[PDB]
């Protein structure tokens, strides 16, 4: 009920983002919400004088048809001044569950300091440019600013002070508009005790890290290989000597000596199967030398391997991987690339949220014109990450197959 | 007197940091400082402007033309930035038919809607005297001055918040905003219309502004940005390509015009030779030559420009509909419709600038382009006719490395059609020979070798002059594609080859590629391996091309 001062950095004007085109209904969601949000007066009517602009679309969340307004905040957080911070909770991943909740209402009851409201600016579009759009400014925090998190802090700690002191074994964490819960119980337990604490934070998503893990390099158990069988075999020790050291290869290409059949069986000789065993050996250890730099960026890359199943890697200096998962979930997208790609993005993104709570960068092997086309209709979480396009075919697909 | 009711200002500043104009007057003729001074007299009469006093140290030129014209460049240089809700045009094919439809032009636009009284100081500007023997007259405006930076933003918004809640209160019309006219729309009898009409220039009276005392001067068909909007169609303004004994760069750019604005009515409009001429030319006057190509697609735009052909307006209660043809060498054309042979609009795409690419992802972009367009003008993504069997589609997007996806869409049998031209196999082939290709060149004197061995005691090694490590890794695999039988297995190192034919192109810009994407075409079965070089992988003979 007293507003902060904020501010932008020095240097940097507020954000001037083209809004994109959006369809009928979509625009009818906007109007409709936004016509409640200005009887309730989180937004107001701004004239010409602001110059300002932020992307807005409307979203359908998980098990629900009303429709969500979602603003794209990525250029004014990337704009607004560094607020501060909290250690991130290291526990959080080791915990056995963890479930994510939309706090987004609360943000709404928090007045905006003045002179910063103008940066808030949006617009809803019209069809065929008919009509002028129609722009409105924040009052309150919006839901998907970073400052929204960090102002509400102190409240959100009061409010969370008789539950925390309750449960010492649950682990609390935020990241904009998410709460995420971790703790030990069972999966009945824990719903009624996320009811209670959604009714104590209504009178003021099942997550499983430990069902998750580091996924190693494997090799083939054979008893007859072919020609093509150690071709490739020799392909991937040969990448994977880049992420370990000692990996050795003389003694297995020592078996293609020769122009064979690609079909032709070989079988192994004894020096050849002592380098393959000894080269299981090096991929069953961890990498050596990886840590985690806070000051650094994270890059996840993705590979579609066909049949839904998809690959994908967390790292932050290369063949240094964080983190590396296989997303194969089937939800309604049995027959839509795009769809697939874009859950995948999310369920990457909530995890590094969950691990080091920040957004990687991602490689995305989509061209740029359908993903930009096309990602709005599938998106269902409250942040957003970076992307860039990927569009050279990279050789190594299969090694993470 | 009936109280007019006030307009509410808008508050403006400058940029940051800067300050306001301070220009010096041109010396004007006796005859021009006489017009001006009527000219500024009547204004002052009427409101629109003020005398000031010396305080003011700002000054902005002016000149007469009488007609008076204030330069305001260097204020609009030092003026905030505006919300400019002008950008993209409504296109017709976007419309939706009405019965009855009147254009009203707003008298004195700019100068009836007053300037933010704060900001009046920084648009003084001075008369000059009689042989500039007294003080030069000075004025500020006191409403929006023409070619100003901020007129039409804050006219626009001003216009909108005064026609808001007559539009509520009517929602059996429509009423659109554009610069300084109004166009209002209603399927109403043609009598409930015009009293609307008059309920609408009442409704603006209310706040001082005047509409068309007399009948309006405007009535179909409407000319409009290049446009011809008549009660049940539209069409672009004639376009007619002229008969030249040579043609220029700047006749070859005028032609490109009048067929890129003229190809969004008229299907088959092809532009790729006539812009193909004018590549890395740079020259206005520069005469080019008409290559046989371009002279046949200028014959037929010719054929096509012929007669006129309308396009007709968007009925939302109809599907929408988008059908691709393919036209050759990167050129696709399009047409959106919700009728069989009327067309609500009409274009074209033209592929990216790359080395390598296939049909297949053409038609993607074009589909991706005609949604976003659509999207914008009807709001909907439309339903799509597209020249490509499903099982292709299926096919190709299944086995694609990357991400694709095209909208609800059915096949339709109008060749040229899009299809996969080769597909390699995922295991290696049984009883199929097995080709270890390798090439390099050496890179001072350009020579190079290419050639194979394979597991049959086939081998070949061909010297090549002039060459490069990319190109001969590409003709080994030429090689190899040239000497097999239908079915054969292909194993390189060459990261490079593999990069471009996991790509999977069927045209490109380098020959050799070519070749061995038409080679690729008359195989029945083609498994291609990669391995490490220098690894000691017998059959992969690096120094066999090394000597
Ligand atoms: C946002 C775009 C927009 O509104 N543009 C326009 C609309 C318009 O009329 C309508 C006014 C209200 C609702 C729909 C309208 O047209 C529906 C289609 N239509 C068009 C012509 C006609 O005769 N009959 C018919 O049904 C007219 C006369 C326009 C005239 C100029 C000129 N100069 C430029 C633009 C115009």
């Given at each position: 009920?007293?507003?902060?001062?904020?501010?932008?950095?020095?240097?940097?004007?507020?954000p001037?983002?083209?809004?994109?085109?959006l369809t009928?209904e979509?625009?009818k969601?906007?109007?409709?919400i936004?016509?409640?949000?200005?009887?309730?007066?989180?937004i107001?009517?701004?004239?010409?004088?602001?110059?300002?602009?932020?992307?807005?679309?409307?979203?359908k969340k998980?098990?629900?048809?009303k429709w969500?307004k979602?603003?794209?905040?990525?250029?004014?957080?990337?704009?607004?001044?560094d607020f501060?911070?909290?250690?991130?909770?290291?526990?959080?991943?080791?915990?056995?569950?963890?479930?994510?909740?939309?706090?987004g209402?609360?943000?709404?009851?928090?007045?905006?300091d003045?002179?910063?409201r103008?940066?808030?600016?949006?617009?809803?579009p019209?069809?065929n440019?008919?009509?002028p759009?129609?722009?409105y400014?924040?009052?309150v925090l919006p839901?998907?600013?970073?400052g929204?998190?960090?102002?509400?802090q102190?409240?959100?700690?009061?409010?969370?002070?008789?539950?925390?002191?309750?449960?010492?074994?649950?682990?609390?964490?935020?990241?904009?508009?998410?709460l995420?819960?971790?703790?030990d119980?069972?999966?009945?337990?824990h719903?009624?005790?996320?009811?209670?604490?959604?009714?104590?934070?209504?009178?003021?998503?099942?997550?499983?890290?430990?069902?998750?893990?580091?996924?190693?390099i494997?090799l083939?158990?054979?008893?007859?290989?072919?020609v093509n069988?150690?071709?490739?075999?020799?392909?991937?020790?040969?990448?994977?000597?880049?992420?370990?050291?000692?990996?050795?290869?003389?003694?297995?290409?020592?078996?293609?000596?020769?122009?064979?059949?690609?079909?032709?069986?070989?079988?192994?000789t004894?020096?050849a199967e002592?380098e393959?065993?000894?080269?299981?050996?090096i991929?069953?250890?961890?990498?050596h030398?990886?840590?985690?730099?806070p000051s650094?960026?994270?890059?996840?890359?993705?590979?579609?391997?066909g049949?839904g199943?998809?690959?994908?890697?967390?790292?932050?200096?290369?063949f240094?991987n964080?983190?590396?998962?296989?997303?194969?979930?089937?939800?309604?997208?049995?027959?839509?690339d795009?769809?697939q790609?874009?859950?995948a993005?999310?369920?990457?993104?909530?995890?590094?949220?969950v691990?080091?709570?920040?957004?990687?960068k991602?490689?995305?092997?989509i061209?740029?014109?359908?993903?930009?086309?096309?990602?709005?209709?599938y998106?269902?979480?409250?942040?957003?990450?970076?992307?860039?396009?990927?569009?050279?075919?990279?050789?190594?697909?299969?090694?993470y197959? | 007197?009936?109280?007019?009711s006030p307009?509410?200002?808008?508050?403006?500043?400058?940029?940051?940091?800067?300050?306001?104009?301070?220009?010096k007057?041109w010396?004007?003729?006796?005859?021009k400082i006489?017009?001006?001074?009527?000219?500024?007299?009547?204004?002052?009469?009427?409101?629109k402007?003020?005398?000031?006093?010396?305080e003011?140290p700002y000054?902005?030129?002016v000149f007469?033309?009488?007609?008076?014209?204030?330069?305001?460049?260097?204020?609009?240089?030092?003026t905030?930035?505006?919300?400019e809700?002008?950008?993209?045009?409504?296109?017709?094919?976007?419309?939706?038919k009405?019965?009855?439809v009147?254009?009203?032009d707003?008298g004195?636009?700019?100068?009836?809607?007053?300037?933010?009284?704060?900001?009046r100081?920084?648009?003084?500007?001075?008369?000059?005297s009689?042989?500039?023997?007294?003080?030069?007259?000075?004025?500020?405006?006191?409403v929006?001055?023409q070619?100003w930076?901020?007129?039409?933003?804050?006219?626009?918004?001003?216009?909108?918040?005064?026609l808001?809640?007559?539009?509520?209160?009517?929602?059996?019309?429509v009423?659109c905003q554009?610069?300084?006219?109004?166009?209002?729309?209603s399927?109403?009898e043609?009598?409930?219309?015009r009293?609307?009409?008059?309920?609408?220039?009442?409704?603006?009276?209310?706040?001082?502004?005047t509409?068309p005392?007399?009948?309006?001067?405007?009535?179909p068909?409407?000319?409009?940005?290049?446009?011809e909007?008549?009660?049940?169609?539209?069409?672009?303004?004639?376009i007619?390509?002229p008969?030249?004994?040579?043609?220029?760069?700047?006749?070859?750019?005028?032609?490109?015009?009048?067929?890129?604005?003229?190809?969004?009515?008229?299907?088959?409009?092809?532009?790729?030779?006539?812009s193909?001429?004018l590549?890395?030319?740079?020259?206005?006057?520069?005469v080019?030559?008409?290559?046989?190509?371009?002279?046949?697609?200028?014959?037929?735009?010719?054929?096509?420009l012929?007669?006129?052909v309308?396009?007709?307006?968007?009925?939302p209660?109809?599907?929408?509909?988008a059908?691709?043809?393919?036209?050759?060498?990167?050129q696709?054309?399009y047409q959106?419709?919700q009728?069989?042979?009327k067309?609500?609009?009409?274009?074209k795409?033209?592929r990216?600038?790359?080395?390598?690419?296939?049909?297949?992802?053409?038609?993607?972009?074009?589909?991706?382009?005609i949604?976003?367009?659509?999207?914008?003008?009807?709001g909907k993504?439309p339903?799509?006719?597209?020249?490509?069997?499903?099982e292709?589609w299926?096919?190709?997007?299944?086995?694609?490395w990357?991400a694709?996806?095209?909208?609800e869409?059915?096949?339709?049998?109008?060749?040229?059609?899009?299809?996969?031209?080769?597909?390699?196999?995922?295991?290696?082939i049984?009883?199929?020979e097995?080709?270890?290709?390798?090439?390099?060149?050496?890179?001072?004197?350009?020579?190079?070798?290419a050639?194979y061995?394979?597991?049959?005691?086939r081998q070949?090694?061909?010297?090549?002059t002039?060459?490069?490590?990319?190109?001969?890794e590409?003709q080994?695999?030429?090689?190899?594609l040239?000497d097999?039988?239908?079915?054969?297995?292909?194993?390189?190192?060459?990261?490079?080859?593999?990069?471009?034919?996991?790509?999977?192109p069927?045209?490109?810009?380098?020959?050799?590629?070519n070749?061995?994407?038409?080679?690729?075409?008359?195989?029945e079965?083609?498994?291609?391996?990669?391995?490490?070089?220098?690894?000691?992988?017998?059959?992969?003979?690096?120094?066999?091309?090394?000597?």
């Amino acid at each position: 009920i007293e507003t902060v001062p904020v501010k932008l950095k020095p240097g940097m004007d507020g954000p001037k983002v083209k809004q994109w085109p959006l369809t009928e209904e979509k625009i009818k969601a906007l109007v409709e919400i936004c016509t409640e949000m200005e009887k309730e007066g989180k937004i107001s009517k701004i004239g010409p004088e602001n110059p300002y602009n932020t992307p807005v679309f409307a979203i359908k969340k998980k098990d629900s048809t009303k429709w969500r307004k979602l603003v794209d905040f990525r250029e004014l957080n990337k704009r607004t001044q560094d607020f501060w911070g909290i250690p991130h909770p290291a526990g959080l991943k080791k915990k056995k569950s963890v479930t994510v909740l939309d706090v987004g209402d609360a943000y709404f009851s928090v007045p905006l300091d003045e002179d910063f409201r103008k940066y808030t600016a949006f617009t809803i579009p019209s069809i065929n440019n008919e009509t002028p759009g129609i722009r409105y400014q924040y009052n309150v925090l919006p839901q998907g600013w970073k400052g929204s998190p960090a102002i509400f802090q102190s409240s959100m700690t009061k409010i969370l002070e008789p539950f925390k002191k309750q449960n010492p074994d649950i682990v609390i964490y935020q990241y904009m508009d998410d709460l995420y819960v971790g703790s030990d119980l069972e999966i009945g337990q824990h719903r009624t005790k996320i009811e209670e604490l959604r009714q104590h934070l209504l009178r003021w998503y099942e997550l499983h890290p430990d069902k998750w893990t580091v996924q190693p390099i494997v090799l083939p158990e054979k008893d007859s290989w072919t020609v093509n069988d150690i071709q490739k075999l020799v392909g991937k020790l040969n990448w994977a000597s880049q992420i370990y050291p000692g990996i050795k290869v003389r003694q297995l290409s020592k078996l293609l000596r020769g122009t064979k059949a690609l079909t032709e069986v070989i079988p192994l000789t004894e020096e050849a199967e002592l380098e393959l065993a000894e080269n299981r050996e090096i991929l069953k250890e961890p990498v050596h030398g990886v840590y985690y730099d806070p000051s650094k960026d994270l890059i996840a890359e993705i590979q579609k391997q066909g049949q839904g199943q998809w690959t994908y890697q967390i790292y932050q200096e290369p063949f240094k991987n964080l983190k590396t998962g296989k997303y194969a979930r089937m939800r309604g997208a049995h027959t839509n690339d795009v769809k697939q790609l874009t859950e995948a993005v999310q369920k990457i993104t909530t995890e590094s949220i969950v691990i080091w709570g920040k957004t990687p960068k991602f490689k995305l092997p989509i061209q740029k014109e359908t993903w930009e086309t096309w990602w709005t209709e599938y998106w269902q979480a409250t942040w957003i990450p970076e992307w860039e396009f990927v569009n050279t075919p990279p050789l190594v697909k299969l090694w993470y197959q | 007197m009936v109280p007019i009711s006030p307009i509410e200002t808008v508050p403006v500043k400058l940029k940051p940091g800067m300050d306001g104009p301070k220009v010096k007057q041109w010396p004007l003729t006796e005859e021009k400082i006489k017009a001006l001074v009527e000219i500024c007299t009547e204004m002052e009469k009427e409101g629109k402007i003020s005398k000031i006093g010396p305080e003011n140290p700002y000054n902005t030129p002016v000149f007469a033309i009488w007609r008076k014209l204030v330069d305001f460049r260097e204020l609009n240089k030092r003026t905030q930035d505006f919300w400019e809700v002008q950008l993209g045009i409504p296109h017709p094919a976007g419309l939706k038919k009405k019965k009855s439809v009147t254009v009203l032009d707003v008298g004195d636009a700019y100068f009836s809607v007053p300037l933010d009284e704060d900001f009046r100081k920084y648009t003084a500007f001075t008369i000059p005297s009689i042989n500039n023997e007294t003080p030069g007259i000075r004025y500020q405006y006191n409403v929006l001055p023409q070619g100003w930076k901020g007129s039409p933003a804050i006219f626009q918004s001003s216009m909108t918040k005064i026609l808001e809640p007559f539009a509520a209160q009517n929602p059996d019309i429509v009423i659109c905003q554009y610069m300084d006219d109004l166009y209002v729309g209603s399927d109403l009898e043609i009598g409930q219309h015009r009293t609307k009409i008059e309920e609408l220039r009442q409704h603006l009276l209310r706040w001082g502004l005047t509409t068309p005392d007399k009948k309006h001067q405007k009535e179909p068909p409407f000319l409009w940005m290049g446009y011809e909007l008549h009660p049940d169609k539209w069409t672009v303004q004639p376009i007619v390509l002229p008969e030249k004994d040579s043609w220029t760069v700047n006749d070859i750019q005028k032609l490109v015009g009048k067929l890129n604005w003229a190809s969004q009515i008229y299907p088959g409009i092809k532009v790729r030779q006539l812009s193909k001429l004018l590549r890395g030319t740079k020259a206005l006057t520069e005469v080019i030559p008409l290559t046989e190509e371009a002279e046949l697609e200028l014959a037929e735009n010719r054929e096509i420009l012929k007669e006129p052909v309308h396009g007709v307006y968007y009925d939302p209660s109809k599907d929408l509909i988008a059908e691709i043809q393919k036209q050759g060498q990167g050129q696709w054309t399009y047409q959106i419709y919700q009728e069989p042979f009327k067309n609500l609009k009409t274009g074209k795409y033209a592929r990216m600038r790359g080395a390598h690419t296939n049909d297949v992802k053409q038609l993607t972009e074009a589909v991706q382009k005609i949604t976003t367009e659509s999207i914008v003008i009807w709001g909907k993504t439309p339903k799509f006719k597209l020249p490509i069997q499903k099982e292709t589609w299926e096919t190709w997007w299944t086995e694609y490395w990357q991400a694709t996806w095209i909208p609800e869409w059915e096949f339709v049998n109008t060749p040229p059609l899009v299809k996969l031209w080769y597909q390699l196999e995922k295991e290696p082939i049984v009883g199929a020979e097995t080709f270890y290709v390798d090439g390099a060149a050496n890179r001072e004197t350009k020579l190079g070798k290419a050639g194979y061995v394979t597991n049959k005691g086939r081998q070949k090694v061909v010297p090549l002059t002039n060459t490069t490590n990319q190109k001969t890794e590409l003709q080994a695999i030429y090689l190899a594609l040239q000497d097999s039988g239908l079915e054969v297995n292909i194993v390189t190192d060459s990261q490079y080859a593999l990069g471009i034919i996991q790509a999977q192109p069927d045209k490109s810009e380098s020959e050799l590629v070519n070749q061995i994407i038409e080679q690729l075409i008359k195989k029945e079965k083609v498994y291609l391996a990669w391995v490490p070089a220098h690894k000691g992988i017998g059959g992969n003979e690096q120094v066999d091309k090394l000597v």
